[PDB]
Amino acid sequence: AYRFNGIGVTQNVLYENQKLIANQFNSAIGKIQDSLSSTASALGKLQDVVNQNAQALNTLVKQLSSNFGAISSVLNDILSRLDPPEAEVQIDRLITGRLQSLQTYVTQQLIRAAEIRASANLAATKMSECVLGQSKRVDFCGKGYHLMSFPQSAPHGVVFLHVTYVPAQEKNFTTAPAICHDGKAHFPREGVFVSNGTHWFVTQRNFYEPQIITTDNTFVSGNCDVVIGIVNNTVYDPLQPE
Amino acid sequence: GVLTESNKKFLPFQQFGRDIADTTDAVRDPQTLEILDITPCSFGGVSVITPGTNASNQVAVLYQDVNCTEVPVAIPTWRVYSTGSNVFQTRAGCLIGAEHVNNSYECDIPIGAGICASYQTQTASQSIIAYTMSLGAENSVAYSNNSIAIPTNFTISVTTEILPVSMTKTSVDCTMYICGDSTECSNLLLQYGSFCTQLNRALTGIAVEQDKNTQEVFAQVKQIYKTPQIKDFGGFNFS
Amino acid sequence: SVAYSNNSIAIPTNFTISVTTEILPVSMTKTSVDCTMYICGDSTECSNLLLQYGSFCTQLNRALTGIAVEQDKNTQEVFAQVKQIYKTPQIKDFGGFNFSQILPDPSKPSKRSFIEDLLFNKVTLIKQYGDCLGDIAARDLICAQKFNGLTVLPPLLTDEMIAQYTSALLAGTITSGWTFGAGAALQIPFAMQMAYRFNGIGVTQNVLYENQKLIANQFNSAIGKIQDSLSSTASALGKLQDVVNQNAQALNTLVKQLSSNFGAISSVLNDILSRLDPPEAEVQIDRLITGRLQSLQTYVTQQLIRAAEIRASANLAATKMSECVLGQSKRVDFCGKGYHLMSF
Ligand SMILES: *[C@@H]1O[C@H](CO)[C@@H](O)[C@H](O)[C@H]1NC(C)=O
Ligand SMILES: *[C@@H]1O[C@H](CO)[C@@H](O)[C@H](O)[C@H]1NC(C)=O
Ligand SMILES: *[C@@H]1O[C@H](CO)[C@@H](O)[C@H](O)[C@H]1NC(C)=O
Ligand SMILES: *[C@@H]1O[C@H](CO)[C@@H](O)[C@H](O)[C@H]1NC(C)=O
Ligand SMILES: *[C@@H]1O[C@H](CO)[C@@H](O)[C@H](O)[C@H]1NC(C)=O
Ligand SMILES: *[C@@H]1O[C@H](CO)[C@@H](O)[C@H](O)[C@H]1NC(C)=O
Ligand SMILES: *[C@@H]1O[C@H](CO)[C@@H](O)[C@H](O)[C@H]1NC(C)=O
Ligand SMILES: *[C@@H]1O[C@H](CO)[C@@H](O)[C@H](O)[C@H]1NC(C)=O
Ligand SMILES: *[C@@H]1O[C@H](CO)[C@@H](O)[C@H](O)[C@H]1NC(C)=O
């Protein structure tokens, strides 16, 4: 109920339809479990990271098979075939080449570490906001209006379950900005004046909860000429009859 | 290279000229006092579009900066992949080996400049087709100046977001990787030991950063709460 | 200084509608490098000693392809947030607001807006073998760098589809408010949407309805003012021009590096091969090969750094588009100075 009040829907609608909400939540959880069980190509990022690291190590190993202008790529052969003072040239060439390879590998590792650090910071702030609280930012914790968040641990990463609110099928209604009862403009406190065929009601923004127009739902202000689209109707007074 | 007529005229004491790349582009013929220009014979990029070799062996070739008419000027199997009957000029060079299709679907292999290539059953024969990209379903909103739409129902939805947290920590032994059980070597590495120390310091910094990331992401709260025994959550099943 | 007492308060009596411009880079030019062409330059004597460094060549090509696919991912993520494409309404009747400048004009190619036309004209951004062969007098750098295996790949999504996505987003946010961000779009009169925004920034909705004409006039005047300022002040799109100039300078200096001999007797392979026997020429060839490989590696590393910075900026732009455009943000200064109302 607190979450529903947070996303701008009155808390009573949750208590009116609790069983449906529980059934929908359970069905959605089962559906995503089945999707994870079936669709294998879902955890692309973690596999990409581990494959990238393995490929970097494998190519670093493979670099040893190239002679950087020397006569051979193995120190034992050079040392067996040549005297020290002249073989030192080939040894120096190989040393320079392998140092360059190591430096390149280290630099690429630094780049990847910086990118992973950025991703980790994003994950940390997402955990702080969406999981430990309710976020009013749009699309930060999933499409729709955010309600809850359940974290799960995955190797070299994290997966979030963003439980969200999505409005279903709608209807077409005729609306007016204000209502002129008796020479006085009236404006809705929280909702919008919606009119069906031959009646006027007031409803909340994100749900259809028709209500009769009373002095407790509207506040008076101004006159009946300034507003562009004012219409005539009647306002119920819940004190005069008594 | 390829020789051609040149408008430039050298000074009497000059023989050949050099460009910004410091290579010989213009020369003066010794037999006939004439100026000629030299240009490389290779110019242009080629890319090979293909589905998995597990699927099929057919390929489509994209020439980046060559019109299909001038393909013979640019360049058995290669000639077949250069002949016509399937040419299709695009905004990023002409494409040979694929069939144009009017319909638009989601992209599979991005050719570039709004063209995508994919494997489809153009009848159960298979052929590589090229089509324009599909942005999405067209739609319009019935907008008036006194009309509003209001939802009457709600649907609870759950989604998954996956983010990397850390990578594998590694360390490198420079002397072992370079020389290897060699007393003759590892004696000339005393000069580059400083570079070795620099690499080791960088790798240790990366590793401690990874540990810090792993700690920071999941250890936000300190007090550890035991799960309750009785669920009685009003209907929600957190099994 | 502020006249501060302990029982005194100041309260505004009027409001002014203001609009600002925020420019962020999204993507950089994609490049690919043919290492063998750049090093050996079509010599069969060379390209036989590059079999040892083919691994380095493959590494560079892999890194550059990764950068290119990252660029495509960035430009897709920034603008393709919403999927359903909404057609702009025919009748405007928006209560006074005139969105003519930003709404697309179908009387021109690519159906791009007036502001988009001016922005495209502000930033000063295909070739052929015959064109490069014939045009010798004008030493254009594009042909020279293309003769050395340096090619520029086009983006997957061109400007027309970007304009289409922008028009769809604008039409959705105008005819449906922010409800089209989550679920299906719901039509709402623009006055009601503006009242919703005013209620969001803590100002009672009635003050909007009492002062609609003044607000519409202020909005139109502000739009015209920024249009004139952008048409006059040229030094406004500094970041995008800086990005393209940086990429062009990097390519130009990579081309220029070919004129230095890394300790060899000469900087051209043809001269060394014509003056020396193979066994003693291989030393100079190896020196030049090592130098040019170092140059290519340096260029690749700098490109990686720039790509990382651009990715960070693109992520910021994507979240800004998600928050300020598809909704109303209560964070201060995130969507401009003042209290945020709209975003186009
Ligand atoms: C409008 O709502 C009132 C409320 O009772 C109802 O009596 C009336 O039939 C409705 N009009 C139409 C056209 O359904
Ligand atoms: C717009 O609304 C006004 C009243 O607010 C109405 O008089 C007018 O007819 C409406 N526009 C159209 C095209 O009907
Ligand atoms: C509303 O009522 C006033 C006074 O009774 C009248 O002048 C006005 O014309 C009415 N409006 C409509 C739309 O009938
Ligand atoms: C050089 O010899 C060629 C062939 O014998 C001849 O065509 C040419 O005219 C000669 N050049 C001069 C300057 O006589
Ligand atoms: C193609 O790939 C599938 C899935 O990886 C595999 O089962 C199949 O055996 C492959 N084809 C061949 C000819 O091996
Ligand atoms: C070459 O291709 C371009 C692509 O825009 C086209 O405009 C031009 O007419 C073509 N020229 C020839 C000779 O094919
Ligand atoms: C699509 O365009 C091509 C080229 O004009 C044409 O041959 C084909 O018939 C078109 N397809 C349809 C379904 O109109
Ligand atoms: C709302 O949706 C649920 C499930 O789709 C359905 O059982 C319920 O009847 C719907 N509400 C109304 C008022 O039809
Ligand atoms: C508020 O500012 C507008 C435009 O500057 C002006 O027309 C209006 O009179 C001002 N309000 C008051 C109460 O002076």
Residue numbers in the entry:
A (entry chain A): 899 to 1140
B (entry chain A): 550 to 624, 631 to 678, 684 to 799
C (entry chain B): 700 to 824, 830 to 1048
Authors' account:
In this study, we systematically investigated BANAL-52 and BANAL-103, which exhibit the closest genetic proximity to SARS-CoV-2, focusing on their spike structures and functional characteristics. The cell entry of coronavirus into host cells is a critical determinant of their infectivity and cross-species transmission, which is mainly mediated by the conformational change of the spike protein involving receptor recognition and membrane fusion. Second, Cryo-EM structural analyses revealed that BANAL-52 S is stabilized in a “locked” state through linoleic acid (LA) binding and an additional N370 glycan, whereas BANAL-103 S adopts a “closed” conformation due to a unique glycan network. In contrast, both exhibit more compact S1 conformation compared to the SARS-CoV-2 S in activated conformation and ACE2-bound conformation. These suggest that BANAL S proteins are likely to be in an inactivated conformation under physiological conditions, which accounts for their lower receptor binding compared to SARS-CoV-2.
Cryo-EM data were collected for both BANAL-52 and BANAL-103 S ectodomains, yielding density maps at a resolution of 3.51 Å for BANAL-52 S and 3.11 Å for BANAL-103 S. The final structural model for BANAL-52 S encompasses all residues from 14 to 1,140 (excluding residues 71–74, 183, 251–253, 625–630, 679–683, and 825–829) as well as glycans N-linked to 18 sites. The entire structure of BANAL-52 S aligns well with the SARS-CoV-2 locked conformation S, with an RMSD of 1.116 Å. The S protein of BANAL-52 contains an additional N370 glycosylation site compared to SARS-CoV-2 S, which, together with N165 and N234 glycosylation sites, forms a triangular glycan pocket that stabilizes the conformation of RBD. Additionally, BANAL-52 S has one linoleic acid (LA) bound to a hydrophobic pocket within each RBD, which locks the RBD conformational changes. Correlating these findings with their receptor-binding capabilities, we speculate that the extra N-glycosylation sites forming a compact glycan pocket maintain BANAL-103 S in a closed conformation, whereas BANAL-52 S is stabilized in a locked conformation due to the additional binding of LA to the RBD, resulting in even lower S-receptor binding. Based on the structural analysis of BANAL S proteins, Y365 in rotamer I would accommodate LA binding, while Y365/361 in rotamer II would cause a significant clash with LA. To further confirm the importance of Y365 in LA binding and S conformational change, a Y365H mutation was introduced into BANAL-52 S to disrupt the hydrophobic LA binding pocket. There was a marked increase in hACE2 or Rp-bACE2 binding for BANAL-52 S bearing the Y365H mutation, and the Y365H mutant S-packaged pseudovirus exhibited efficient cell entry compared to wild-type BANAL-52 S in both hACE2- and Rp-bACE2-expressing HEK293T cells.
